[PDB]
Amino acid sequence: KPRVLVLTGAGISAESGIRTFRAADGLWEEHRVEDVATPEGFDRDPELVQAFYNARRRQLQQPEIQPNAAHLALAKLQDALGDRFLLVTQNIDNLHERAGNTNVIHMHGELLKVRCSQSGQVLDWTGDVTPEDKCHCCQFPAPLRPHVVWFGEMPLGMDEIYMALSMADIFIAIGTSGHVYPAAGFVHEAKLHGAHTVELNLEPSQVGNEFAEKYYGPASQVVPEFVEKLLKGLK
Amino acid sequence: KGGAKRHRK
Ligand SMILES: [Zn+2]
Numbered sequence: 001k002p003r004v005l006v007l008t009g010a011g012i013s014a015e016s017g018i019r020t021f022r023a024a025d026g027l028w029e030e031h032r033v034e035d036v037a038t039p040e041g042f043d044r045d046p047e048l049v050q051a052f053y054n055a056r057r058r059q060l061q062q063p064e065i066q067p068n069a070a071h072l073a074l075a076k077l078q079d080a081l082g083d084r085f086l087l088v089t090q091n092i093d094n095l096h097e098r099a100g101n102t103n104v105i106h107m108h109g110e111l112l113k114v115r116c117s118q119s120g121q122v123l124d125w126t127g128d129v130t131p132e133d134k135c136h137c138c139q140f141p142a143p144l145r146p147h148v149v150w151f152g153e154m155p156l157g158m159d160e161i162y163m164a165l166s167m168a169d170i171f172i173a174i175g176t177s178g179h180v181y182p183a184a185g186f187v188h189e190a191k192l193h194g195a196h197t198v199e200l201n202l203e204p205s206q207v208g209n210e211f212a213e214k215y216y217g218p219a220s221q222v223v224p225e226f227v228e229k230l231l232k233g234l235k
Numbered sequence: 236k237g238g239a240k241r242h243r244k
Contacts, residue, residue, distance in 0.1 A: 023242070033242070108240065151240050158237050179244070182237030206243065 001234065002169035004081055005195070006074060007186055008089045008096070011175025011202050012219050015068045018060065018093050023179050029055075037150045046143075047131075053146040054128040057111050060093055061126065067099040070174070070223030075100035077227050080234075086164045088157070090176065090183050092148050105157040107183065109148040118142030155182065166193040170230070173199050175219060178206030187211060200226055 010020035021028040021037075028036060031052060035041045042049045059065070078085045078101050087104045089096060092111040096104045114125040116135035119142070123135075134141035149155050165171065171190035176199075178184045187197050187210045199211040200222050208214060215222045 021242075023244075026242075149240050151242060154239050155237065162236055179242055181241050181243065184243070185237070 001084070002081075003084045003164075003167050004077065004086075004170045004172065004230075005164045005168035005190070006077070006085070006087045006172045006174060007176060007183060008074075008087070008091060008174045009176035009180075009183070010091060011177075012070050012223070013068075013091055013093050013095055013175070014202065015218060015220050016071070016093075016095055017065050018091075018095075023177060033151060037148075038152050039150055040152075042145065042150070050129050050131075050146075053111065053148065056092075057126070057128070057146075060111055065095075067095045068220045070219035071095050071099035071101075073224040073227040074174075077230070078102070080231055086168075088161050088164070088186075090180065105161060107149070107155040107157055107161060109146070109156060111146065111148065113147035114144040115147040116142050117145050122147050158182075161186070162189065165189040165195075168193070168195040171195040171197045172226075173197070173201075173205070173211070174223060175201060176205050178208065198226070 021033050026033055036049055036052045087096060087101050088107055089104060090108050092109055094112055112126055114123050114129060116137050119137045121137040129144055133144050135144060165186055168190055173187060184207055187207055190197055197211045199208050199214040201216055215226055
């Protein structure tokens with residue numbers, strides 16, 4: 001019965017083998033975020049930036065990378081709640097989809113998609129992007145970029161996300177650091193509109209104290225435990 | 236709403 005909005009971040013995919021910017025040193029795969037996740041960075045050195053996303057995109061599809069029990073629990077939660085569930089993720093991986101979730105809002109885009117730099121049309125894309133790869137949507141073919149929202153760019157699906165933040169009865173943030181905005185501010189919006197807020201994390205987030213209920217530990221243990229608790233509670 | 240993607244600090 002309750003409307004449940006889940007926000008996930010990089011932590012949920014850590015046990016699956018996917019790393020992210022660890023704000024301790026502000027390095028993602030030992031690259032400064034300035035250089036690999038800004039429009040400037042892509043303007044300055046598109047070869048390096050495309051190579052970086054090519055590496056991430058290849059690594060995501062390696063056999064050792066699999067959804068973990070936290071991802072599966074969120075698919076079970078959607079199964080239980082149907083249209084009264086929405087999953088928003090900051091993650092660019094496809095592990096929620098592999099677990100069985102549908103209608104996932106990727107507010108920062110998707111590593112397995114690219115975008116025409118001219119038209120904005122989005123393409124599924126599982127391989128490398130090379131300079132020879134141009135769009136097929138424009139008369140004058142244009143370069144393709146990762147369909148990944150960079151720092152300084154506007155996230156995707158925000159109107160729907162803000163609508164769900166208001167509508168939610170329960171807002172659960174899973175695996176988020178509390179350092180990336182606007183996502184890190186969602187808990188405030190959820191609280192403003194009356195939701196019960198839950199943090200599930202390995203490490204308490206910067207904004208952890210804003211959450212009403214919280215559980216910490218490995219995601220693969222904590223998230224299934226919480227989903228079980230929630231579904232039991234809902235009857 | 237929300238502004239652009241940005242890191243604290
Ligand atoms: Zn095009």
